[PDB]
Structure formats: C-alpha cells, structure tokens
Amino acid sequence: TTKDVIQKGISVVGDLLGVVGFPFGGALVSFYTNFLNTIWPSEDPWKAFMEQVEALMDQKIADYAKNKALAELQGLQNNVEDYVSALSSWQKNPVSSRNPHSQGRIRELFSQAESHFRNSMPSFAISGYEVLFLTTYAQAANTHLFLLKDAQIYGEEWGYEKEDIAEFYKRQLKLTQEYTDHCVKWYNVGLDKLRGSSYESWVNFNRYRREMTLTVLDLIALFPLYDVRLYPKEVKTELTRDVLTDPIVGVNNLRGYGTTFSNIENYIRKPHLFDYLHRIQFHTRFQPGYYGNDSFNYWSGNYVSTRPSIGSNDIITSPFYGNKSSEPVQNLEFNGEKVYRAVANTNLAVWPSAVYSGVTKVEFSQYNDQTDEASTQTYDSKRNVGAVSWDSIDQLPPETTDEPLEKGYSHQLNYVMCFLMQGSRGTIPVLTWTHKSVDFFNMIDSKKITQLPLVKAYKLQSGASVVAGPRFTGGDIIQCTENGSAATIYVTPDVSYSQKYRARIHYASTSQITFTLSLDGAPFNQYYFDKTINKGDTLTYNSFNLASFSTPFELSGNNLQIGVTGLSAGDKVYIDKIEFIPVN
C-alpha cells in the first residue's frame, strides 16, 4: 500500500538529482513541468501525504487543521503554475521581447509565490500535528527553496534591484537551516514514538524509518545544492544511506513468535564504509507437514559477502545468520551485477496446534552495466514452493515508469540477513538496499562540481570510524578523534589532460584544525580550518561548515588521503564530504 506517494517521493528526488547546483535553462523548465504533474497537479497528492503518516502513526490530523492545510495548498498550486508558465515563456522567448513591462509581470508572479510560501508554512506545522504533517511540510519546504534559488539565476534579467536579489538570498539561507532542522527534529520524535518490544513494533518502526527516508530525508539532503552561488555549476552527487525493506514472512500474524525488537534492531548493519553485494550462500531446511503431503523446504539461514568501495579488493564475509543447512547449500554470485529487484514465494504448514511458514523461493533481477544486459538468478528450496507473496517493487518503486525497470530502478540489493523466530519456529529474512545514484568508480567529473562522501573511502586509519549521520547529509559520516591520517579514498579522473581542481570540505570540528591532502602518499594541499562546534554539542544544520583549500591541483594519482592535526584530548572532527571544483 501507499506505493503512490512512495513513487512520487522517489521520483522527485531522482529528478532533482539532475537539476542540482546551477542548472541549464532547458533542464530547469523540463524539471518544472514534471514537478507540476507529479507534486502540484491537484489536492490528491497532498491528501495522500497526510494519510501516509496517519497510517504510519495510527493517528489522525484534526479535520480543521487538515482542511486549512489543503486550502493553503490549492492557493500555492495556482501560484506555482502561474509562475512556471511565465518562466517557460521567458526561457523560450529571445532576448529581444524582454521589455520592462514583461519583466514586471514575471517579477510580481515570483514575489507572489515566494511570499505565499512563507505565509503558509506554519499551517503544515501546527502544534500537536508536526509529525503527521511531515511529508507535506517537507514537500512544501522543498518547493519554496527550489523556487527561491531562481531569483539568483534570473534576478537581474527580470530587472530586480540588487537589494531584492540579496534579500531573497538571505531568506534562502535562513530557511534552508530552519526547514532542515524542523524535519530532522520531528522525524526523530516520530521514530522514538514507535520504538517497542515486539516484532510487530519493529516492523512499524522500520516502515516509518524507510518511508520517511524516501519522502523526507533524501529530499532535505538536496537543499544546500540549491545555492547556485556556492554551486555555480551542475553538481554530481549521491545518496549513501541504507534502507531496509519489510521482513519477508508467510503469515500476517505470528502469534508471538516474531523475533523481538531488540533482537532485530541491535543486529542490523551498523554504520560502515560503503560496499556492494558480492555473494549469497543460501541454507535450506526441511519443514515436515503434519500429513507429510504438506511439507516444504525453506530458507533457514545465510552468509553474505560484500566487496568494498573501489580501491580495495578484499572481500568481506559476514558471520553466519540463522540456521545451518539440512539440505544442499545454494550459492549465487553477483560480481559486477546490480540487483534491482527481488520477488519471493512463501509457504505454510498448518499443524494441529502450530503453524510453520517460510521463504521457499527468491528470484533476483540483475543488470550488467558493462555488457548493458539484464537477467535473473533464483534461489529455490526445491520442495513445495507455494506462491509469490513479497515483491521489492512494492516498497522500492522505480524512479521512472517511463523506461524499462533495468534502467529506471531506484535501489539495488546490498545486504541479506536471516533472523530466527522465537522458540525457533522459523526464519525471517531481512533485505538492505542502497540508492541507484551511488557511483562505484568515485569519478571526478571535469565539467561539474563533484561531491565525494567520505563513507566511499576503502580504508580508515589512526582510529577514525564511521558514525551515524545527522539525518540531513544523505548518509553516514566519519568521526576523527586523533591527530594523523584518517581516510584513504580511491578517485577516478574522467579526463586524460592536466585538468586543475579546487577542493572544498564539508566538516564539523570542536577546534581549529589542519586538513592535509595527499595523492598516492605525497602531500599537495594543507590548510587551516575553523572550529564549528563546542565539545559535546549535538549535530544540527549549523554545526557543519563548507570551506575551500587555497591552492589548485591536478589529479596526478588515485589514492586521496585526508589527514587531520591540531586535535587536543577530547576534540572531535566529523567529515561528511570532499568536493572537487574544475578550475582553469
């Protein structure tokens, strides 16, 4: 259920990933038309976003608050549409038909929409309904900010005063912080509200976490890239966070046998350097039916092997999960393949005073980006398979329903983990997924500003570690507690000639520090950076700073090493991303 809003959520993020930073006019208009068809066509999507959280929270918005919100939204729609049509005409029309009279028409349409947004936002955040309005607020906030950046692109062309463009920019800065902080704060309130002790508690908890990631968290991660002054070129970026699909079960009610909240949540993958699905070892067991004829085999346990980020080739193999095989082991290899879908069969045996159910068949859809070919690999228990009951597409829809799945998919398989039911009545498999935007090669684009997340490193050192992200960065971060090296990341230059770059770093620090950059063990850049936080502070939007290194450099190697010095006992440095700016 709710796949509709989940798809819209996924699609917007996917489209925005193409117009992030300073976009070319044609691309900006194109985006806007889809945007209007997706998010701003009628009150239906907005109504669906409110219903979405109501379903996750098992709470309702007071009718009065629901009606006002919808009213504001109808008005905002007209503002957005009137604006886009005019913007479309502006781009299309030659630099001749631009008279003072048409400039004023676009200027006031723009001022209206922007003003209407600031006035309406509080309606999507009324006391006691903050969490329930979350997806609505996130989507409205996004529109407001995306709208705002246009003033820095076309401001002068439209004939706005220098003072006006500046006013818009400051307003954009303040709101990026507010909207981001608001979303994280309430996201967490919602998350904590769903923590329980039962298996059913965890499913709801994790469903909320996944759905809020797709509709809210991924979105707010893009906000800073709307600053066309800081990002005066197109931006190449990616989302590195994990999402867990609902557990694959044969029955709707486990009658108490479901794995406990703690036995699931405390065992799912902890903050880790980025990696890819390499291999899966399926373990099968025989489940006897009370009458023999109703028996079946089922997936009892597994092993998982991942390959690290580019630059390292040592395969990571997981501990054993679940129950050892009674039947012959099945092995599936994925070297290079991208799993964009997983469809499962389940079966059940009804005993006089017990019900036994398990995952009997799993069909994986894979795509080979090298040989540009799709295919399938499947796990089969071999005894009494039953019918399909679980399809990843229902939870992780494609970015586009335009192209074929092997092209339009939004996520790929990263992890597989088997949990044991209480009193060992069966096995519950859980699948982890990663976003399609992740570039395996860590390629530095020669025409764009490239954002490189530190979790893409292949090697950590001097006691650096992967820590849970502050929820607004699109992934996890690196924590540095000691003076010395910290991380080594492998980089792929996209051009052969001596292209020069400037580097920028997105970090948080308890003290004034020094960052040093090395290529293949040789230092090339070293600079001084400001303190951004106090010891023990919590990480909010303002905690991070984006600072440039002075000197330009060429990519005369592949192994980029970031080192830190100037730390004292108790000091901490958090690194989010490294950026590369193509320079002449």
XYZ file of C-alpha atoms in Angstrom:
584
model
C 0.000 0.000 0.000
C 0.839 3.777 -0.319
C 3.217 2.918 -3.234
C 1.763 6.001 -4.996
C 3.255 8.547 -2.565
C 6.400 6.443 -2.238
C 6.849 6.589 -6.025
C 6.249 10.336 -6.126
C 8.768 10.704 -3.291
C 11.389 8.616 -5.099
C 10.785 10.326 -8.478
C 11.132 13.897 -7.208
C 14.485 13.102 -5.571
C 15.569 11.332 -8.779
C 14.599 14.315 -10.998
C 16.138 16.857 -8.613
C 19.380 14.901 -8.743
C 19.596 16.142 -12.355
C 18.905 19.861 -11.691
C 21.008 20.234 -8.594
C 23.505 23.132 -8.454
C 23.323 25.675 -11.324
C 21.070 24.061 -13.936
C 20.862 24.863 -17.662
C 17.645 26.739 -18.599
C 16.137 23.939 -20.669
C 16.753 21.351 -17.979
C 15.189 23.690 -15.305
C 11.972 24.204 -17.308
C 11.746 20.440 -18.147
C 12.034 19.644 -14.481
C 9.320 22.135 -13.597
C 6.760 20.533 -15.974
C 7.239 17.043 -14.495
C 7.287 18.584 -11.000
C 3.899 20.171 -11.602
C 2.454 16.900 -12.959
C 3.851 14.890 -10.037
C 3.562 17.036 -6.882
C 1.387 20.004 -7.870
C -1.413 18.672 -10.155
C -4.327 18.663 -7.633
C -5.105 18.248 -3.935
C -4.896 14.402 -4.303
C -1.118 14.076 -3.722
C -1.243 16.373 -0.658
C -4.182 14.451 0.798
C -2.221 11.217 0.227
C 0.855 12.593 2.025
C -1.186 13.432 5.087
C -2.862 9.973 5.006
C 0.564 8.363 4.649
C 1.890 9.478 8.044
C -1.537 8.960 9.615
C -1.215 5.307 8.577
C 2.368 5.006 9.969
C 1.500 6.732 13.241
C -2.046 5.332 13.680
C -3.181 8.915 14.478
C -5.234 11.473 12.576
C -4.969 15.186 11.871
C -7.868 17.214 13.297
C -10.237 17.920 10.333
C -9.906 21.703 10.851
C -6.109 21.516 10.581
C -6.411 19.174 7.578
C -8.837 21.498 5.741
C -6.756 24.654 6.289
C -3.622 22.913 5.073
C -5.397 21.754 1.918
C -6.778 25.313 1.359
C -3.294 26.875 1.538
C -2.041 24.213 -0.867
C -4.759 24.942 -3.518
C -3.680 28.579 -3.442
C 0.017 27.680 -3.643
C -0.682 25.484 -6.646
C -2.084 28.396 -8.677
C 0.978 30.474 -7.646
C 3.368 27.740 -8.774
C 1.582 27.086 -12.103
C 1.262 30.780 -12.998
C 4.946 31.157 -12.181
C 6.159 28.170 -14.248
C 4.140 29.108 -17.354
C 5.701 32.580 -17.265
C 9.182 31.186 -16.582
C 8.737 28.789 -19.523
C 7.809 31.729 -21.814
C 10.814 33.714 -20.581
C 13.338 30.990 -21.428
C 11.673 30.291 -24.846
C 11.403 33.970 -25.874
C 14.506 35.653 -27.357
C 16.486 38.360 -25.526
C 14.519 40.870 -27.695
C 10.874 40.586 -26.429
C 12.244 41.313 -22.935
C 10.689 44.747 -22.317
C 10.259 46.483 -18.892
C 6.583 45.504 -18.999
C 7.134 41.723 -19.269
C 9.888 41.886 -16.624
C 7.425 43.330 -14.074
C 4.890 40.597 -14.896
C 7.354 37.802 -14.070
C 8.751 39.718 -11.052
C 5.334 40.011 -9.381
C 4.336 36.394 -10.177
C 7.582 35.302 -8.494
C 7.151 37.633 -5.475
C 3.619 36.294 -5.014
C 4.568 32.612 -4.927
C 7.565 33.150 -2.641
C 5.540 35.379 -0.241
C 2.613 32.896 -0.232
C 5.017 30.157 0.803
C 6.374 31.969 3.891
C 2.871 32.839 4.939
C 1.533 29.251 4.554
C 4.384 27.116 6.015
C 3.208 27.406 9.676
C -0.027 25.608 8.564
C 1.984 22.470 7.913
C 3.461 22.579 11.437
C 0.546 23.217 13.837
C 1.092 22.240 17.490
C 0.442 18.565 18.081
C 0.435 17.736 14.356
C 4.108 18.319 13.495
C 4.911 14.615 12.795
C 1.720 13.964 10.885
C 2.334 16.991 8.594
C 5.982 15.929 7.984
C 5.812 14.748 4.305
C 3.510 17.670 3.452
C 5.897 20.161 5.158
C 8.937 18.546 3.508
C 7.399 18.779 0.019
C 6.150 22.358 0.522
C 9.523 23.402 2.023
C 11.336 21.876 -0.966
C 9.161 23.786 -3.434
C 9.748 27.059 -1.502
C 13.530 26.663 -1.560
C 13.716 25.457 -5.156
C 11.576 28.462 -6.143
C 13.834 30.832 -4.195
C 17.064 29.950 -5.992
C 15.521 31.144 -9.302
C 15.919 34.704 -8.028
C 19.708 34.242 -8.118
C 19.607 32.847 -11.652
C 17.192 35.208 -13.375
C 17.092 38.076 -10.862
C 18.974 40.623 -12.999
C 17.351 39.518 -16.309
C 13.920 40.110 -14.702
C 15.110 43.563 -13.640
C 15.125 43.043 -9.865
C 17.019 45.547 -7.706
C 20.430 44.437 -6.324
C 18.813 44.801 -2.821
C 15.925 42.462 -3.820
C 18.125 39.570 -5.095
C 20.175 39.914 -1.866
C 17.069 39.877 0.335
C 15.986 36.668 -1.415
C 19.354 35.036 -0.859
C 19.466 35.776 2.911
C 15.936 34.474 3.181
C 17.031 31.289 1.316
C 19.916 30.791 3.817
C 17.763 31.147 6.904
C 15.070 28.835 5.587
C 17.466 26.118 4.479
C 18.620 25.830 8.104
C 15.066 26.007 9.562
C 13.385 23.605 7.194
C 16.249 21.069 7.558
C 16.275 21.277 11.374
C 12.487 21.116 11.583
C 12.419 17.883 9.536
C 15.137 16.061 11.478
C 13.680 17.069 14.888
C 10.176 15.732 14.144
C 11.469 12.796 12.171
C 13.236 11.652 15.401
C 10.181 12.407 17.572
C 8.174 10.058 15.284
C 10.862 7.387 15.279
C 11.092 7.260 19.135
C 7.319 7.167 19.426
C 7.305 3.832 17.527
C 10.043 2.008 19.493
C 8.549 -1.070 21.157
C 9.500 -4.538 22.387
C 7.592 -6.777 19.919
C 8.260 -7.926 16.387
C 5.165 -6.022 15.212
C 6.594 -2.891 16.888
C 9.823 -3.144 14.895
C 8.042 -3.620 11.523
C 6.100 -0.379 12.054
C 9.192 1.395 13.401
C 11.263 0.332 10.342
C 8.431 1.041 7.861
C 8.221 4.610 9.168
C 12.006 4.914 9.036
C 12.148 3.700 5.431
C 9.143 5.781 4.186
C 10.374 8.936 5.934
C 13.793 8.391 4.339
C 12.329 8.222 0.811
C 9.870 11.085 1.176
C 11.622 13.390 3.650
C 15.285 12.681 4.464
C 16.539 12.186 0.864
C 14.840 15.465 -0.065
C 16.300 17.677 2.654
C 19.746 16.316 1.706
C 19.468 18.263 -1.587
C 18.533 21.684 -0.100
C 22.150 23.024 0.150
C 22.732 22.249 -3.529
C 20.023 24.804 -4.410
C 22.561 27.528 -3.514
C 23.568 28.472 -7.108
C 26.126 30.947 -5.782
C 28.085 28.303 -3.898
C 27.245 25.814 -6.638
C 27.582 27.880 -9.849
C 27.913 24.720 -11.994
C 25.949 21.438 -12.217
C 26.599 19.097 -9.227
C 27.412 15.370 -9.379
C 26.295 13.785 -6.103
C 24.865 10.591 -4.493
C 22.852 9.280 -1.533
C 24.775 6.683 0.545
C 22.183 5.726 3.190
C 20.700 2.251 3.838
C 17.016 1.366 3.731
C 15.552 -1.950 4.935
C 12.519 -3.447 3.207
C 9.782 -5.085 5.351
C 10.762 -8.587 6.552
C 9.647 -11.462 4.270
C 7.020 -13.551 6.162
C 4.453 -16.136 5.042
C 1.797 -15.186 7.648
C 0.095 -11.918 8.651
C 0.136 -12.615 12.385
C 2.970 -14.581 14.004
C 1.095 -15.173 17.247
C 4.014 -14.052 19.447
C 6.772 -15.924 17.638
C 8.198 -12.924 15.800
C 11.808 -12.003 16.615
C 11.928 -9.323 19.356
C 12.521 -5.664 18.571
C 15.975 -5.726 20.277
C 16.982 -8.977 18.578
C 16.440 -7.305 15.215
C 17.414 -3.619 15.730
C 20.591 -4.419 17.710
C 21.749 -6.773 14.939
C 21.065 -4.928 11.695
C 24.184 -3.435 9.988
C 25.838 -0.650 11.966
C 27.469 2.464 10.411
C 30.001 1.094 7.876
C 32.141 2.167 4.977
C 30.153 1.817 1.653
C 30.170 -1.641 -0.025
C 28.425 -3.789 -2.625
C 26.620 -7.155 -2.728
C 29.096 -9.797 -3.916
C 27.765 -13.257 -2.927
C 24.990 -15.056 -1.025
C 25.034 -18.534 0.466
C 21.507 -19.934 0.923
C 20.872 -22.522 3.651
C 17.798 -24.703 3.394
C 15.891 -26.814 5.899
C 13.077 -29.293 5.676
C 9.766 -28.462 7.289
C 7.622 -31.501 7.850
C 3.885 -31.217 7.339
C 1.614 -32.949 9.846
C 0.375 -35.208 6.991
C 3.650 -35.482 5.004
C 1.967 -34.267 1.762
C 2.026 -30.631 3.042
C 5.780 -30.468 3.760
C 8.131 -27.885 2.267
C 11.709 -26.719 2.315
C 12.582 -23.192 3.378
C 15.392 -20.648 3.567
C 16.851 -21.194 7.100
C 19.999 -19.148 7.155
C 22.657 -17.402 5.122
C 26.139 -15.972 4.615
C 26.713 -12.684 2.768
C 29.800 -11.392 1.102
C 30.331 -7.795 0.009
C 33.116 -6.125 -1.890
C 34.381 -2.764 -0.554
C 34.479 0.570 -2.328
C 36.834 0.939 -5.387
C 40.491 0.813 -4.336
C 40.297 -2.361 -2.222
C 39.662 -5.917 -3.374
C 39.496 -7.898 -0.145
C 36.013 -9.471 0.142
C 34.166 -9.065 3.427
C 32.312 -12.153 4.597
C 29.587 -11.954 7.242
C 29.086 -14.184 10.282
C 26.562 -16.975 9.788
C 22.893 -15.809 10.105
C 20.055 -18.161 11.108
C 20.102 -21.981 10.979
C 22.616 -24.339 9.341
C 21.516 -26.166 6.203
C 19.949 -29.618 6.400
C 19.748 -29.515 2.603
C 22.365 -28.780 -0.111
C 23.750 -25.240 0.024
C 22.979 -22.784 -2.809
C 25.399 -20.081 -3.893
C 24.641 -17.046 -6.043
C 27.418 -14.717 -7.264
C 26.914 -11.079 -8.301
C 30.382 -9.728 -9.339
C 29.525 -6.580 -11.319
C 25.749 -7.266 -11.437
C 23.274 -4.785 -9.958
C 20.274 -6.450 -8.246
C 17.348 -4.108 -8.953
C 14.560 -6.461 -7.866
C 13.754 -9.383 -5.519
C 10.486 -11.369 -5.644
C 9.677 -14.064 -3.052
C 7.443 -17.111 -2.527
C 6.323 -18.296 0.882
C 4.566 -21.406 2.173
C 2.892 -22.638 5.311
C 2.055 -25.942 7.022
C -0.894 -25.975 9.415
C -0.281 -28.338 12.355
C -2.947 -29.206 14.983
C -1.520 -26.673 17.452
C 1.088 -24.823 15.337
C 1.662 -23.088 12.020
C 5.008 -23.224 10.245
C 5.909 -20.767 7.462
C 8.982 -19.878 5.435
C 10.509 -18.286 2.341
C 10.692 -21.036 -0.292
C 11.749 -19.176 -3.482
C 13.555 -15.923 -4.297
C 14.020 -14.567 -7.804
C 16.661 -11.852 -8.205
C 16.570 -9.455 -11.221
C 20.088 -8.243 -12.137
C 21.550 -5.754 -14.626
C 25.102 -5.742 -16.021
C 26.041 -2.087 -16.757
C 29.240 -3.232 -18.521
C 27.617 -5.598 -21.074
C 24.352 -3.497 -20.905
C 22.230 -6.728 -20.269
C 19.584 -7.831 -17.689
C 18.976 -11.388 -16.403
C 17.700 -13.343 -13.367
C 19.203 -15.632 -10.699
C 16.987 -17.569 -8.349
C 17.003 -19.466 -5.091
C 14.672 -22.480 -4.988
C 14.010 -24.566 -1.835
C 13.185 -27.441 -4.250
C 10.213 -28.737 -2.159
C 6.635 -27.288 -2.202
C 7.342 -23.694 -3.266
C 3.842 -22.191 -2.993
C 3.115 -18.719 -4.466
C 4.752 -15.245 -4.527
C 3.904 -13.072 -1.545
C 6.689 -10.423 -1.472
C 7.854 -8.011 -4.222
C 10.561 -5.351 -3.554
C 8.968 -3.091 -6.189
C 6.016 -2.513 -3.828
C 8.327 -0.918 -1.245
C 11.031 0.437 -3.574
C 9.309 1.648 -6.746
C 11.361 2.786 -9.800
C 12.433 6.413 -10.299
C 10.630 6.322 -13.701
C 7.718 4.232 -15.069
C 8.804 5.605 -18.486
C 11.899 3.416 -19.083
C 12.234 -0.389 -18.532
C 12.980 -1.497 -14.902
C 16.673 -2.304 -15.559
C 17.013 1.377 -16.466
C 14.512 3.150 -14.196
C 15.038 1.294 -10.894
C 15.823 3.382 -7.787
C 17.661 0.928 -5.489
C 19.920 -2.093 -5.547
C 20.439 -5.021 -3.110
C 23.304 -4.528 -0.646
C 22.654 -6.956 2.177
C 20.753 -10.098 3.250
C 20.353 -11.144 6.887
C 18.313 -14.074 8.370
C 16.673 -13.731 11.796
C 15.395 -16.619 13.927
C 11.815 -16.712 15.178
C 11.181 -17.283 18.918
C 11.160 -20.958 20.009
C 12.805 -21.390 16.588
C 9.533 -21.874 14.701
C 11.227 -20.453 11.580
C 13.409 -17.898 9.740
C 12.728 -14.260 8.937
C 14.888 -12.788 6.120
C 15.589 -9.035 6.024
C 16.959 -7.225 2.950
C 19.064 -3.998 2.955
C 19.149 -1.658 -0.081
C 21.215 1.270 -1.351
C 20.328 4.156 -3.716
C 20.999 3.895 -7.500
C 22.845 7.253 -7.543
C 25.945 5.722 -5.923
C 28.881 5.797 -8.379
C 31.128 2.703 -7.985
C 34.076 4.424 -9.651
C 34.220 7.598 -7.445
C 34.567 9.501 -10.710
C 35.644 13.172 -10.703
C 33.610 14.980 -13.387
C 35.630 17.547 -15.439
C 32.609 19.800 -16.093
C 30.690 19.609 -12.782
C 31.330 20.164 -9.082
C 31.774 16.601 -7.744
C 30.637 15.718 -4.177
C 32.549 12.719 -2.687
C 31.044 11.238 0.530
C 33.777 10.064 2.943
C 31.988 6.738 3.516
C 33.128 5.886 -0.058
C 36.651 5.505 1.294
C 38.080 1.980 1.303
C 40.441 2.463 4.268
C 40.164 4.160 7.676
C 43.157 4.880 9.931
C 44.529 6.433 13.137
C 41.281 5.406 14.903
C 38.848 7.121 12.536
C 35.376 5.470 12.340
C 32.013 5.526 10.555
C 29.383 7.126 12.747
C 25.599 7.522 12.341
C 24.805 10.520 10.149
C 22.894 13.560 11.497
C 19.944 12.532 9.131
C 20.344 15.553 6.764
C 23.509 14.528 4.823
C 22.106 11.590 2.779
C 24.330 9.107 4.603
C 26.759 8.428 7.461
C 29.866 10.383 8.440
C 33.455 9.917 9.573
C 34.485 10.690 13.150
C 38.144 11.631 13.803
C 39.397 11.575 17.370
C 43.178 11.538 16.896
C 45.913 13.532 15.160
C 47.116 11.782 11.979
C 45.752 10.130 8.854
C 42.035 9.474 8.787
C 40.766 8.126 5.489
C 42.017 6.962 2.082
C 39.577 7.190 -0.823
C 40.245 5.965 -4.399
C 39.471 8.513 -7.123
C 38.771 8.096 -10.855
C 39.629 11.101 -13.114
C 37.234 11.321 -16.115
C 39.749 13.088 -18.432
C 43.296 12.439 -19.565
C 44.666 16.028 -19.796
C 46.091 18.086 -16.868
C 42.738 19.478 -15.573
C 43.122 21.577 -12.433
C 40.827 21.476 -9.394
C 39.991 23.308 -6.163
C 38.887 21.260 -3.163
C 36.224 22.075 -0.603
C 35.461 20.157 2.610
C 32.151 19.779 4.494
C 33.069 19.116 8.125
C 32.321 19.850 11.821
C 35.073 20.433 14.415
C 35.461 21.159 18.177
C 38.703 23.059 17.498
C 40.729 24.974 14.926
C 42.348 22.232 12.772
C 44.573 21.495 9.860
C 43.477 19.315 6.971
C 46.159 17.764 4.743
C 45.567 16.152 1.301
C 47.859 13.551 -0.222
C 47.836 11.765 -3.538
C 49.494 8.353 -3.544
C 51.335 9.225 -0.311
C 52.604 12.643 -1.344
C 51.117 15.784 0.324
C 49.865 18.502 -2.039
C 47.432 20.603 -0.034
C 47.416 21.691 3.577
C 45.257 24.396 5.125
C 43.772 25.849 8.323
C 40.062 25.375 9.175
C 37.707 26.935 11.741
C 36.098 25.389 14.828
C 32.347 24.837 14.221
C 31.047 23.339 17.488
C 31.682 23.018 21.220
C 32.612 19.725 22.919
C 29.541 17.590 23.424
C 27.199 19.597 21.148
C 24.574 17.777 19.104
C 24.855 17.907 15.330
C 22.354 20.280 13.672
C 22.478 22.104 10.305
C 24.719 24.965 11.529
C 27.241 22.544 13.037
C 28.759 21.963 9.571
C 30.972 24.348 7.624
C 31.966 24.192 3.914
C 35.483 25.558 3.374
C 37.882 25.686 0.381
C 41.538 24.833 0.258
C 43.587 27.729 -1.166
C 45.742 26.125 -3.908
C 44.599 24.355 -7.103
C 45.943 20.919 -8.036
C 45.850 18.182 -10.736
C 44.703 14.555 -10.170
C 48.157 13.055 -10.766
C 47.162 9.888 -8.859
C 44.242 7.924 -7.475
C 44.662 7.484 -3.756
C 43.393 10.558 -1.949
C 44.271 10.710 1.742
C 42.806 13.234 4.181
C 44.793 13.835 7.356
C 43.916 15.839 10.480
C 46.087 17.606 13.074
C 45.583 20.161 15.814
C 43.347 17.995 17.982
C 43.689 18.003 21.758
C 42.380 15.351 24.162
C 38.579 15.345 23.889
C 38.435 17.022 20.486
C 36.349 15.570 17.625
C 36.173 16.185 13.867
C 33.312 14.943 11.673
C 33.817 14.725 7.911
C 30.859 14.491 5.574
C 32.106 15.153 2.022
C 35.047 16.315 -0.091
C 34.198 18.357 -3.196
C 36.142 18.910 -6.430
C 35.774 22.131 -8.462
C 37.001 22.092 -12.091
C 39.235 25.182 -12.436
C 41.257 26.843 -15.286
